[PDB]
Design a protein around this nucleic acid. Structure first.
Lengths: 80, 100, 164, 79, 94, 82, 56, 84, 72, 75, 69
RNA sequence: AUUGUUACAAUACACAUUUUUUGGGGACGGGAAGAGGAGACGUCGCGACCCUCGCAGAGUCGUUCUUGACUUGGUCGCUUGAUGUUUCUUCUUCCCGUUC
C-alpha cells in the first residue's frame, strides 16, 4: 500500500482513509473535510462488521462521521 | 552539614569491608550510566526505599543478585566503550571495579 | 517485451477502477497491447498492491500465472489471449470474476485444472473459447466447476445442475 | 503546567501504547499536538497474546491513547 | 491571565492530589488501578493537573483468561506516560 | 468554524440517514441543524439491529450518541468549500 | 527615536515623514504617520506611558 | 466515446450487470464508467471508454452478442457523457 | 439550605463511604480534602469489595469520574 | 414553562420526595429528597435509600450524589 | 450555547428512548441548552405508573419520538 | 539602447452533560449419503411464465461558442441464494485440496 511521510491532517486531505470505530466496525472512505473534533467527511462509507473470524461488508451512506467514537484513521490508497 | 548512613542497613548483616565494596560497585555503575543503575535498583517496585535510607532494602540473595547485575552492567559498558575482546579472569575485573 | 519488474513499476497505477476495490493495474507501458509472449513472470514486483482488476488483455500469454494472497486479483481481465491451460495453486480464493474471453482453450480435458473445483479453484468462469463449441460442454462445466455462477454471461441454473 | 507539553517536546521516538483494544503499537510519534493526536510511522498490530497483523502508515486520536511507552528514558518537562 | 493559572499550581498540594505530589517529591511506590481489571505498581517521578503521570519501575498485573482458572501475568516496564482517565485510585505505601 | 457543521446546515430538506451508538439505523428528512449536531426528522423509518423495524412520524436525535450522519452525493464539491 | 520597550523605532525628517519600524519582526512593514508637510518636525519623543508618540 | 447498449436481460441485478459489462468491455479498451447513471435497466446502459477507437471496435465486434440470453444491440451515443 | 460543596467541606476530617460503578468496591476511610473537580483523598482506607475487605490501604486518593455517591 | 436552573431553586424551597435512577444498575434505584443548589448537576440528597425495583432497603445516610451518575429526578 | 429547537415539540406527548433499554414517555413542559428536558409525565414498560413529574438529565437522552406530529 | 485599511482562518487559553479525558499412515477444510440444527424479524442477490418499451441527478430561462439563476429495478419462486438480532437443545462412509 502506497503512503508517503505525511506531516498533518491538512496535507493528507482528499485521500482514501480507513476509519476504526469504538466497538470495532471497520470503515473506508475519501476524507473530504476537517474539524476541531476530527469529524472527517467520508466521500462514500463502506462499513464492515465482525461478530464477537471473518469481516462483513456494506454500503449505506456517504456520511460525515463523528469524532467521539473514532479510534484511529489509516490511509488505504491515493486518488487520481 | 548533613549526615547520612550510606550503609543504610548492611553493617548488621554483612561486614564493613563488604559493605564498602558493595557501595563501590553501586557508585561505579551509577557513574558509568545512572539511568541503568536506577532501573536495576528499582526492578521490583515492592522493594521500596525507606524514609531514612539511600538504597532499597533487599534480602541477602536479592542483594547478591543486584550486585551481580551491577557488575554485568559495568563490564558491558566497558566493553562498549574501549572495544576490549574479553575479560581474562575475575581478579583482572577487580582492578576495573575499584580503580577505573 | 517480456514481463519484467521494471515494466510493472512503470505501469500506470493511478486511475482506480471505481466499480470495485482500488488500483486497476495495467503492466508494462500498457497491459492492453503489452505483448507478453511468455507466462506472467515477475508478479512479486506488484506485491499484492490492490476487486483488483489486473487487466492483462490483448496479450500473448500462454498460461495464466498468479502469485498473491486471498484478496489480490478478484476481477482479473485476460481478454483476447492465447490461454492454453490455467492450472495453479497460488490464486485459490481471490480470482472470482475471471474475464477469459477469446482464449485458446481447445478441449474439455484442458479445463480439468479448473474442474474438481471443490478446493482446486474457489471460483472461475471461462467463456468465448474453442471448448465452448464442443458437445455437452456447458453441462460438463456445470458438473466439474460448481462454483461457476455465470457461464458465458448466462447463469448456471438449478435445472442445468440437475441435468449435469 | 501540563503533561502534554512534555509529549510535544519529544519526536521521532519508537514509543509503544496500550490502547483501549489492548494491542501494542511501537512507532514514531512524528507531529504530536495539544490534544494527544499522535501519527504512527511504522508499528505492530493485533486485530480483535497479540497476533501479527501490522500496518505501515497511521494516525491516532488522543482519546484512545491510554498509555505511551518509553523510547528515551529522560526526565525534562520544564523549559 | 497569569494569576488565574498560577494560583491553580498550589491547589495540587492543598487538595486531593497533595498525596500524589508528596509521592512524586519523595520517590516511593504506589498501587495504580485501571478500568479493565488491571493492577499496576510503580514509583512516581513527574505529575500534572489532570493526573497525567509518569513513573518508573512499572510492574503490571492483569488477567487474560476465563472465569474458571485465573492467570496472573507479569511484565517489567518503565518510563510510561499513562492517561488520567484510566487512573482510578492511587495510594502511597509506607 | 467547522466545515462538517456548515455542510450539515446546507443540507436542510434532504434524505439524510443516521446511525446511533446502539445501532439504530434511520432514514428520513432533515428538519434543522446547529453548532452541536442536534438532528430532527420527519417521516423517519426505523430499521434497527434488534430486528423489529418500524415507521416513525417524527424523531429528535442527540449528537453525542450519534456515530455518523449520512448525506447525499449532490453536495460534494460546491457550494461549501470554495 | 527609540521607544522605551526598545522595539519601536521612529525614523523621521523635518518635511513630515514619520515611519515607525518594529525591530522584533524584519518582515513587518513600517507604519507611516500623517504629519502635514508644511509643519516642520523638530523632534519625536515616546512618552513614558508607553503609548504616546509626541511629535514636536 | 460512449456506446449506448439496448435489448438486454432486465432480470439480472444492477451491480452484477455493471460488472458483467465491465468484464466484456475490458478487451477493447479501458472502461471509464464504473456504474450506470440511468438506473432503469432492461438494456439501457452507456459504456464510457477512454479511447474512441476502442469504442468503435466494441461497436463493431459486440453487435448482437449473446449476453444473459438476449443479443445486445450496440450503437453510438447521441450526446457526449458528463465524465468525458 | 445545605449545599453540596458545603456538605463536602463539613465532611472533611470525618468518616466517608464512596462506591464506584465499574468494579463496585466500597472504599471506607476518613476524608482529608477535596478540590473544584471533586477529587477524593482518604485516610485509613479499606477497600470493601462488596462487604469483604481486600486489605487495609492506609493513605489514599480517588478520582472524580469513577465514584457514584458519598455517605457516612 | 419551567427551566432547569430555577427548578433547583424550587426543589430547595420545597424539599419534596424523589426517586433517583442510576446509569449502570437498572434495578437498584435511589430514593430520598434533594436539598443543595449548584451550577452542575451534582446536589445533596438527604435521607437516601437504594431500593431494588422490578424489571429492598439499602443502608445509607445523606447521599451527595455525583453530577454525571444521576439518571432521573422527580419533584 | 446554541439552543435546540424544542419549541416545536412543546405541549405534546413524546415516547422517549433512554440509554440501557428504558422506554419512558411524557409531555414536554420545559427545555434548555444542556438538554435537561423538564417533562410532566412518566410511565415505565406491561405499562405501570411511577411518579407524575420527572426532570431527566442531558446525557441519558438519545431518542425521543413525538406522538402528536 | 513595496506602503496602508478591512474581512476570514492558523499560532497563544482548553477535567465537568453535543465530542480528546470515562459507561468496561495421521491431522485440518469443503461437498454428498445414512443414523440418532430449528423457528421469527428484517436487509441485498440466482431464475421468470411477469411487468414495463426506450439516449439521457432532472426541468426552465438569461447570455454567448460554454456557463450563472430559479424549481423538486417493483412482484413471484430459490426446485436446498447470501446475511445481522433473537430463543431453545453428534457419529459413520465416500470423494477433492493443504500439511508432515
Amino acid at each position: 500500500i502506497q503512503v508517503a511521510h505525511s506531516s498533518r491532517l491538512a496535507n493528507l486531505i482528499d485521500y482514501k482513509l480507513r476509519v476504526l470505530t469504538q466497538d470495532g466496525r471497520v470503515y473506508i472512505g475519501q476524507l473530504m473535510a476537517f474539524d476541531k473534533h476530527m469529524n472527517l467527511v467520508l466521500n462514500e462509507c463502506i462499513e464492515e462488521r465482525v461478530p464477537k473470524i471473518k469481516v462483513e461488508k456494506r454500503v449505506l451512506g456517504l456520511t460525515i462521521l463523528r469524532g467521539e467514537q473514532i479510534l484511529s484513521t489509516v490511509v488505504e490508497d491515493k486518488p487520481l | 552539614m548533613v549526615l547520612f548512613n550510606i550503609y543504610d542497613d548492611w553493617l548488621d548483616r554483612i561486614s564493613s569491608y563488604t559493605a564498602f565494596s558493595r557501595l563501590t560497585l553501586l557508585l561505579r555503575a551509577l557513574k558509568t550510566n545512572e539511568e541503568s543503575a536506577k532501573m536495576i535498583l528499582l526492578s521490583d517496585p515492592t522493594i521500596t526505599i525507606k524514609s531514612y535510607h539511600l538504597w532499597p532494602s533487599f534480602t541477602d540473595e536479592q542483594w547478591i543478585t543486584i550486585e551481580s547485575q551491577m557488575r554485568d552492567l559495568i563490564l558491558t559498558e566497558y566493553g562498549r566503550k574501549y572495544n576490549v575482546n574479553i575479560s581474562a579472569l575475575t581478579q583482572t575485573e577487580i582492578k576495573d571495579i575499584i580503580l577505573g | 517485451m517480456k514481463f519484467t519488474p521494471s515494466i510493472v513499476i512503470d505501469a500506470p497505477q493511478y486511475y482506480v477502477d471505481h466499480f470495485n476495490g482500488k488500483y486497476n493495474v495495467d503492466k508494462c507501458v500498457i497491459l492492453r497491447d503489452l505483448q507478453l509472449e511468455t507466462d506472467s513472470e515477475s508478479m512479486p514486483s506488484s506485491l499484492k498492491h490492490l476487486t483488483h482488476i489486473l487487466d492483462l488483455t490483448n496479450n500473448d500469454l500462454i498460461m495464466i500465472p498468479d502469485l498473491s494472497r486471498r484478496d489480490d486479483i478478484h476481477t482479473l481481465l485476460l481478454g483476447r489471449n492465447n490461454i492454453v491451460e490455467v492450472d495453479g495453486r497460488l490464486l485459490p480464493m481471490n480470482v472470482q470474476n475471471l474475464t477469459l474471453s477469446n482464449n485458446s482453450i481447445r478441449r474439455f480435458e484442458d479445463l480439468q485444472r479448473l474442474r474438481r473445483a471443490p478446493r482446486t479453484l474457489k471460483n472461475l468462469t471461462l467463456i468465448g473459447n474453442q471448448v465452448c463449441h464442443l458437445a455437452n460442454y456447458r453441462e460438463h462445466v456445470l458438473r466439474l466447476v460448481p462454483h461457476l455462477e455465470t457461464l458465458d454471461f448466462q447463469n448456471v441454473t438449478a435445472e442445468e445442475r440437475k441435468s449435469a | 503546567m501540563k503533561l502534554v507539553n512534555f509529549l510535544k517536546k519529544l519526536r521521532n521516538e519508537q514509543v509503544t501504547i496500550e490502547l483501549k483494544n489492548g494491542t501494542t503499537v511501537w512507532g514514531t510519534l512524528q507531529s504530536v499536538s495539544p490534544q494527544m493526536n499522535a501519527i504512527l510511522t511504522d508499528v505492530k498490530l493485533t486485530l480483535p497474546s497479540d497476533n501479527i497483523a501490522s500496518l505501515q502508515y497511521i494516525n491516532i486520536r488522543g482519546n484512545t491513547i491510554r498509555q505511551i511507552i518509553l523510547p528515551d528514558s529522560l526526565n525534562l518537562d520544564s523549559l | 491571565r497569569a494569576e488565574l493559572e498560577e494560583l491553580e499550581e498550589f491547589e495540587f498540594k492543598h487538595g486531593p492530589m497533595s498525596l500524589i505530589n508528596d509521592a512524586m517529591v519523595t520517590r516511593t511506590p504506589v498501587i495504580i488501578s485501571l478500568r479493565n481489571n488491571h493492577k499496576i505498581i510503580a514509583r512516581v517521578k513527574a505529575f500534572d493537573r489532570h493526573c497525567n503521570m509518569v513513573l518508573e519501575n512499572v510492574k503490571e498485573l492483569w488477567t487474560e483468561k476465563k472465569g474458571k482458572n485465573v492467570i496472573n501475568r507479569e511484565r517489567f516496564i518503565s518510563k510510561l506516560f499513562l492517561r488520567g482517565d484510566s487512573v482510578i485510585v492511587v495510594l502511597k505505601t509506607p | 468554524n467547522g466545515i462538517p457543521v456548515k455542510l450539515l446546515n446546507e443540507a436542510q430538506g434532504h434524505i439524510v440517514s443516521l446511525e446511533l451508538t446502539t445501532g439504530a439505523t434511520y432514514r428520513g428528512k432533515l428538519v434543522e441543524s446547529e453548532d452541536s449536531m442536534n438532528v430532527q426528522l420527519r417521516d423517519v423509518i426505523a430499521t434497527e439491529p434488534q430486528g423489529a423495524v418500524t415507521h416513525m412520524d417524527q424523531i429528535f436525535v442527540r449528537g453525542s450518541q450519534i456515530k455518523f450522519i449520512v448525506v447525499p452525493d449532490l453536495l460534494k464539491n460546491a457550494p461549501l468549500f470554495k | 527615536v527609540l521607544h522605551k520597550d526598545s522595539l519601536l523605532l521612529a525614523l523621521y525628517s523635518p518635511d513630515g515623514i514619520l515611519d515607525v519600524y518594529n525591530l522584533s519582526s524584519p518582515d513587518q512593514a513600517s507604519s507611516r504617520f500623517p504629519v502635514d508637510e508644511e509643519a516642520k518636525i523638530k523632534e519625536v519623543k515616546f512618552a513614558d506611558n508607553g503609548y504616546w508618540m509626541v511629535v514636536e | 466515446n460512449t456506446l449506448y447498449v439496448s435489448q438486454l436481460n432486465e432480470k439480472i441485478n444492477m451491480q452484477r450487470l455493471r460488472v458483467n459489462l465491465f468484464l466484456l468491455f475490458a478487451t477493447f479498451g479501458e472502461v471509464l464508467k464504473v456504474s450506470m447513471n440511468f438506473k432503469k435497466q432492461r438494456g439501457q446502459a452507456f459504456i464510457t471508454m477512454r479511447t474512441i477507437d476502442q469504442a468503435s471496435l466494441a461497436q463493431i465486434s459486440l453487435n448482437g452478442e449473446r449476453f444473459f440470453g438476449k443479443p445486445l444491440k450496440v450503437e453510438f451515443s447521441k450526446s457526449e457523457t458528463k465524465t468525458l | 439550605p445545605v449545599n453540596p460543596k458545603p456538605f463536602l467541606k463539613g465532611l472533611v476530617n470525618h468518616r466517608v463511604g464512596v462506591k464506584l460503578k465499574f468494579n463496585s468496591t466500597e472504599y471506607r476511610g476518613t476524608l482529608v480534602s477535596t478540590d473544584n473537580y471533586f477529587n477524593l483523598q482518604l485516610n485509613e482506607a479499606e477497600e470493601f469489595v462488596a462487604g469483604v475487605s481486600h486489605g487495609t490501604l492506609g493513605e489514599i486518593f480517588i478520582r472524580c469520574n469513577n465514584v457514584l455517591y458519598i455517605r457516612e | 414553562m419551567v427551566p432547569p436552573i430555577n427548578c433547583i431553586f424550587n426543589f430547595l424551597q420545597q424539599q419534596t420526595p424523589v426517586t433517583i435512577w442510576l446509569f449502570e444498575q437498572i434495578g437498584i434505584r435511589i430514593k430520598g429528597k434533594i436539598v443543595g443548589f449548584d451550577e452542575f448537576m451534582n446536589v445533596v440528597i438527604d435521607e437516601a435509600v437504594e431500593i431494588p425495583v422490578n424489571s429492598k432497603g439499602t443502608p445509607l445516610g445523606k447521599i451527595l450524589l455525583k453530577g454525571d451518575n444521576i439518571t432521573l429526578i422527580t419533584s | 450555547v446554541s439552543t435546540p429547537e424544542l419549541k416545536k415539540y412543546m405541549d405534546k406527548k413524546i415516547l422517549l428512548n433512554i440509554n440501557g433499554s428504558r422506554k419512558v414517555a411524557g409531555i414536554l413542559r420545559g427545555y434548555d441548552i444542556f438538554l435537561n428536558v423538564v417533562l410532566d409525565d412518566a410511565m415505565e414498560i406491561n405499562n405501570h405508573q411511577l411518579g407524575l413529574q420527572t426532570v431527566i438529565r442531558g446525557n441519558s437522552i438519545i431518542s425521543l419520538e413525538a406522538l402528536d406530529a
